Paper text:
Using X-ray crystallography, we show that the ciliopathy-associated centriolar protein CEP120 contains three C2 domains. CEP120, for example, plays a key role in the duplication, elongation, and maturation of centrioles, which in principle could impact the production of a functional basal body (Comartin et al., 2013, Lin et al., 2013, Mahjoub et al., 2010, Wu et al., 2014). All three C2 domains of CEP120 (C2A, C2B, and C2C) adopt the PLC δ1-like topology II and are structurally similar to each other (root-mean-square deviation [RMSD], 2.4–2.6 Å), with major differences found mainly in their loop length. Thus, the CEP120 C2 domains probably play a role as protein-protein interaction modules.
For the O.n.-A200P mutant (equivalent to the H.s.-A199P JATD mutation), we obtained diffraction-quality crystals that allowed a successful structure determination to a resolution of 2.1 Å. To obtain this crystal form, we introduced an additional mutation (G307S) that we found serendipitously. The CEP120 C2B (H.s.-A199P) mutant structure revealed an overall preservation of the C2 domain fold and only subtle structural changes. In the WT structure, the O.n. A200 residue is located at the end of β strand 1 and its side chain points inward toward the hydrophobic interior of the domain. The replacement of this alanine by proline causes a change in the main-chain dihedral angles of the preceding residues, resulting in a local structural change. In the WT structure, the main-chain carbonyl O of O.n.-Phe199 (H.s.-Phe198) makes a main-chain/main-chain hydrogen bond to O.n.-Gly333 (H.s.-Gly333) that cannot be maintained in the A199P mutant due to the conformational constraints imposed by the adjacent proline residue. In the mutant structure, the loss of this hydrogen bond is compensated by a peptide bond flip, allowing the main-chain carbonyl O of O.n.-Ala198 (H.s.-Ala197) to form a new hydrogen bond with O.n.-Gly333 (H.s.-Gly333). The most significant conformational change is observed for O.n.-F244 (H.s.-F243), the side chain of which moves to avoid a steric clash with the bulky pyrrolidine ring of the proline. Other structural differences between the WT and A200P mutant, in particular the conformational change in loop 1 and loop 3, are most likely caused by different crystal-packing interactions.
Numbering used by the authors: 168 to 341
């Protein structure tokens, strides 16, 4: 199963076009970054202003970049939503989402990743038990991790203040 973009119609076909004809909307919201400064080592001194950061992920092969921000201590980040339209059948779409790799969201500087988190799209498929009547949403604050630590250190506990990003993934009929 693959999501084929129909450029003139602005949706992605999942399944046979003559059998799978229902319209769905898959939305990703990113919001409320916290403690992003902890993704940068304390021995790396950034100048007060002049840096530009943003968030990136890929949604069904579509590149999604947030508005830029310049202060890791206070991103002042307005919540941002991206949505893709999908023409499929309820059962085919769930199977497709169950086979997808995790949604990977990066804190970026240029083309460098300062940290990333994974959001399970197969978990969204599992809770999509009532799409005829209610949209299904996977939502939480997800922990951001830097790309490469040199040595193993004592892991942070889930109760600890770590870099996090609010991520909500919602699936519904159109």
């Amino acid at each position: 199963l693959e999501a084929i973009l129909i450029p003139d119609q602005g949706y992605h076909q999942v399944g046979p076009a003559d059998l799978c004809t229902d319209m769905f909307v898959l939305s990703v919201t990113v919001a409320f970054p916290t403690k992003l400064e902890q993704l940068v080592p304390s021995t790396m001194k950034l100048s007060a202003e002049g840096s530009e950061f943003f968030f990136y992920y890929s949604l069904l092969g579509n590149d999604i970049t947030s508005e830029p921000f310049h202060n890791l201590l206070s991103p002042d980040f307005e919540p941002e939503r991206a949505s893709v339209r999908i023409r499929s059948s309820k059962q085919i779409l769930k199977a497709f989402l169950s086979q997808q790799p995790s949604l990977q969201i990066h804190l970026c500087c240029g083309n460098h990743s300062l940290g990333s988190t994974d959001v399970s799209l197969s978990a969204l498929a599992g809770i999509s038990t009532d799409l005829d009547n209610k949209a299904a949403t996977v939502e939480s604050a997800f922990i951001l991790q830097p790309p490469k630590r040199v040595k193993q250190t004592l892991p942070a506990l889930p109760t600890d203040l770590q870099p996090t990003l609010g991520v909500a993934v919602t699936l519904r009929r159109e």
